[model samples]
Target: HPDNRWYKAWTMFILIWALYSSFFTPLEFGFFRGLPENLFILDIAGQIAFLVDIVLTFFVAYRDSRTYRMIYKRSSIALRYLKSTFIIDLLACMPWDIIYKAAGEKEEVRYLLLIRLYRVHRVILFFHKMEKDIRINYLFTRIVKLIFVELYCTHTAACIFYYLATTLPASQEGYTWIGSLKLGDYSYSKFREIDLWTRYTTSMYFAVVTMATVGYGDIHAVNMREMIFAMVYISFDMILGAYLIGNMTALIVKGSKTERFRDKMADIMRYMNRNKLGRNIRGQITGHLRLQYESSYTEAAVLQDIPVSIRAKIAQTLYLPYIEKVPLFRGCSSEFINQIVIRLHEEFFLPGEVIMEQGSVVDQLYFVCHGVLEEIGEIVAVLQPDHSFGEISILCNIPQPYTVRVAELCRILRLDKQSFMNILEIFFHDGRRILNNLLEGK
Candidate 1:
């Protein structure tokens, strides 16, 4: 189900990209042509290409939804498919239908092309769940190439428009590239005024250099007409160049974001596989991460008792003898005590080290298994072997009654909170029975 959540989200992403590609290709082609006033043959051909693209896009969406298990039942599946991104994309690309309907009603249909506004949904593709499918990389590469090609075409068209407008008379300014060429055919004046081949090559160079935002200034357009045309073309070149740079920057940033996300997941996976006790903790930590928690218990290192298997053997060899002298657990069965004993932690205290601070919540109870410790408050016993402190705090929901200061370096078994609670519950019930028998002198 978790995989399905991301998979369906990814399918939506692919559909969005397909729709954008379908609509954008034709819109971009028309924008480059810049001659939509009379509905030329190429315009009509481009429209047909766009319609074909949309149909193909619909098929792609339907196939993707099917692959991702977005629908299952025969009857309901057809309805779900129709209602999915497939339908949304199909409707988004129905400019032909819009144009046809408008013409039937005797209205101008040019505005139907503005259905390209739906292409704004293309931005949603960026947030889609990316699967590790190998085909995705190839698809993305093609998208980048398509954008590059469009960039080239736009720059090229700007150059050709500038070239023809500059060389021809002011009377011909309203003419499209093909129309201007047709008018030039009557007089053949263009070839006499400028070398036709050299002019085209120079225009191409100007186009490339201008689109790259590099003004060499070596080659200048000759007249007032030529200069104004150059200025306008260069302005367009600057904007297109900036747009391409922005797109490249976004692509780089997106790639970096994806890498960082992958690294975080890899780190989590590595941490989960590193320890046996990690299973439940891994599940909890991953769940917490999903909820966006910024804290982790694994990063906390408390000196309170830890399991022996998790402790060093050198520590066990040094502290076992002293830990056995603790009196509170004197009557306890060896097996029960050994469980805690094997896991005993010995903490060395300096002369200034405060062992237990008064009023602090005592999650750990420490025994004075070795060395001397002084109880600061009124005390009933001297601290030595078979003596311990801080038990009452652990035995009840209470804070430490008095601070205990170490007079010497101490070796002790610091009882873990949960283990301490278990021991206390057993002692409470069993100790009560033992005390009752003693009172009756039995």
Candidate 2:
């Protein structure tokens, strides 16, 4: 049943409620204005929801902690839950508020309400799960996840600040952070009774200031309690800011693989200028670099982590369709085309870029994927995506008879001369069959 997508479905629903409890636990803990507002209905759902998760874990398959293999047996699953992991889940899932309040303990039991908030470890696991899935853009997924972390942390800190301010004795309320406050001829003395938005935003404003270390003399801690909490908040925020920027930089550098590309490009131009190369060859060299830079995807690096069998399977699916349509491979066998595609390396060309010239040995056979090409030989001939060129030169070992250049943007999938010939060397029947087939073609 673990193989079934429906098995995954129930866990996803649980994740939704896990996140629901994550946000609520802070607000419910920090705000003590006569306690359980009707919002506690959701906490009832959270308690029931997490209790279901506790049961769900026993049924769902888990990987063995020893060897990391999937353990499908219910005995192991049941035994494992009872042995170790069940304690925390059971501990955190208790309706702590209901119990403590029932026992006539009111004030401090609210602190354990945060224990219910421990579903974040689940959220963290969900993060790694969501990220490994390639269907979503990893860049967007990762950045948004980071955004939520900062937002939640700042939200939690803000709520706590307001809570600390409220913890003071009512007569001495003027000593807390938001206490003794005047906002441009407006006093926040009855801070609790102030407009909800005003209290929330002002507390959040202080949180942001501490987060960025920008306490601009306006809203600051007044008493020993406020000062000490602010101290811890800012230190945590300092490292929190580091994590934020470090990850932000990682995404930037990831997307701007182009920045590093630009450096090499500028350096190439400087070298060309210093050496004083001619205009034609200079353009040729630059265009060649930019051609690959613009359209080519170097998947050996990107897809390196993917298993080879899957990658080969992907290469066949993507490149096979284009391979069979190629003129030289018109009547090719399935296995033959499959072999050729495995060696195909896709490249790109900008307009006016020549891949080879007349009277030169052509070392590459190119299959056109798109755009227009022209052979600047005795007569200019147009080559469309249907054409695969360098056929004669490749098998015959002849030099290129005509210069081929891009008319516009073109995708050219190149095959190595020796590699393709080696395949012909293996499949002798198709080799000569394809040779005569090649002889009949342009």
Candidate 3:
């Protein structure tokens, strides 16, 4: 329905950029000493671009979101639009602007900026774009929960690794635990300093290794404190490992069910393609006439064979072939395919009628329902009935391949852009089937 491509494309670009910008907030706090001198200018530019993206998203959603709306109402489109992720992006980007204007120095705002890093988590929604089904949602939710549990186990393991590495001596490290039992010193002998940050990293690494049950003998805990920590961490690692194994088993079972479901659908489509009904319908409409020949045949025969309860299931298949015969398509799936079929007028041309000039803005594709249309150009081709022309050039986005002047009166289905897309998706899961046919010289 929307005609402006650039605006649509730019809005997507801005959304990606906004999500990327959120990651920089965490890096800004952890890795950098201070904000750059031109930070304010970058902030303003990002904000302006984000605002424009928000406006475009609002318009696109207002037009299309109603169909898929589970809770949204048409009257509240503007309010709902502003309440989307763009608002999260706006908030994430605004803290710096506020802090800079209030304090003039960026130091006072560093903590607030660190808090903004949490918004980066919202970027995970990009995966949800392709994840519409309940199974995918449940899978993603389970994954998130497992990840949270893993993080907790990992944190504990990290703490243990740090305690062992820093508090224990090399040789007598083992004896430190015995010494602790006797109330003796349990600290590492060569301990220069208890570096908590280094311990954090080491402990994290230890947690990861233990969680995976890949223990290397390079690191050891000497002191009782470190040994106790390691013991607790190893216990959690075992529990988490078993939990993950159970999740993997469940996933495998679910995957088998999904595979069976896909196999069932594929078998159904193949049977429909090969069945007696399909052959009968094809025989009833072998040569195209002045108008569509298959609709009534389908309505009476195929529709009766199909159960009334499963009409929507058969609708796509039943509609595709009729839509495919429309000439204007040269077969491209765009928004207009349905409109052109339902609304346009059908016209025929006589032998002397100049169908089109060579250099005209080629707008329509003509289907030869019956008789032949002769081409007159660099190389002439006779377009046969049940076949289409004009698509070769339009689909290529080039000039018309040839000039056509009717050599004989033609009974043709004239199609524009609108009818092409609606029919194409029905015949093809992604229109790849038709693309393959086109490539095969059909």
Candidate 4:
């Protein structure tokens, strides 16, 4: 329950701070000479925020992966927090910078601040949470996220590059990449005295040049430290480039449907070749496959795994208004039609194909959503939309009265006799009224 509202807001607020910590810490570590006294205030505030978050953690609930119900007990949430990230969270809350100054300790566990950076995972989990949402477009989110990843990697590189130049610019460190360089004839050995913006961009420029994989060497590795660092960085760039290019190409080719259908389409073509299912029969079969491959039947089995009530509800919304206009069920209860609507399956009949022959046992009901049907030889012409047939035939247990064929392209909703009969048993008066219409016609 805590996760459902206020807790979400709190977590997101903390998440924002985690993003700042991870992004800001690298710059803090690599560029500053002695103390970045101002930004440390912001860092201490976030530590205090996380310190209280430990208390909030005990109240929020989590579902067990196996059972799925959000377990509400306090002890388990406390135990879960204790057993998992709690140790790191507690370690991150320690104000090590303050301790270093107070005790005058020269050596420090400054890298332990990386434990603070671990909070960045919250931002990643947030993106994953957003990915499950249906409203957002996926590729936009994915591509944008990859750009963020690209920028962050280069940003870290820039930070370290700046730190390396700072450490080497003085005395006998043998000059540095920036210190040795001429940018617009302003030599950078006095880079310490340069404007802040110029120095920052130069650092970033070198980082991007390396990570994006073509070094023009206007400013480059001037010493062994820079050499080893760029070497490891290039190795990482190749592996990342693989993932970046691979995901992009597969997404570009297609996702989900086209690939699935292409494989099935290829196999079906092979199947017909092996069986020698000859050309004339093949024409009808292939035409039907082409229709279904691109149209309504794709939706047929796509939704099969969802619960029955939801599918029924969707069909009820889609079919009921049109069903109300059907003359065949003029005197019947609407609930009978409601039952019929839920049981219906869809189909598309190609032009010039006979759907059912005359005198065939009426084992099904076919309702037209949109399309014309033609019954030949009696001077009848085109049938219209929103009309349904097969109720009287299936209800009476008799052969179909006439051949029903698709004159033009037709889309149909079908109900099988087995389902109709049980629905009829439950809604008997509506069933009786339908049979009476057949008797009157006779």
The lDDT of each candidate is: 0.52, 0.78, 0.54, 0.75
Higher-lDDT candidate of 1 and 3: 3
lDDT value for model 4: 0.75
- Model 3 residue runs over 4 Å out of place are 1-11, 37-48, 63-75, 81-88, 95-108, 118-122, 133-247, 257-442
Decide which is better by lDDT, 3 or 4.
Answer: 4
Task: Please identify model 4 stretches exceeding 4 Å from their true place.
Answer: 34-41, 95-112, 134-147, 249-298, 302-325, 330-343, 348-365, 368-386, 389-411, 415-432, 438-442
Give each model a TM-score.
Answer: 0.28, 0.80, 0.35, 0.70
The top-ranked prediction according to TM-score is 2
Q: What is the lDDT of residue 391 in candidate 2?
A: 83
Off by over 4 Å in 1: 1-23, 26-29, 34-71, 83-88, 91-363, 366-442
Better of 1 and 2 by lDDT: 2
Worst 10 residues of 2 by lDDT: 295-304
| Rank by lDDT (best first) | 2, 4, 3, 1
Which candidate order results from sorting by TM-score in descending order? 2, 4, 3, 1
Candidate 2 whole-model C-alpha lDDT, 0 to 1 = 0.78
Residue-wise C-alpha lDDT for candidate 1, range 173-218, written one tens digit per residue: 4342322332322532343255445445444555565566676654
How does model 2 score by TM-score?
0.80
| Winner by lDDT | 2
Off by over 4 Å in 2: 1-4, 82-85, 134-146, 195-197, 253-256, 299-346, 355-364, 375-381, 392-405, 413-435, 438-442
| RMSD from true fold, candidate 3 | 17.2
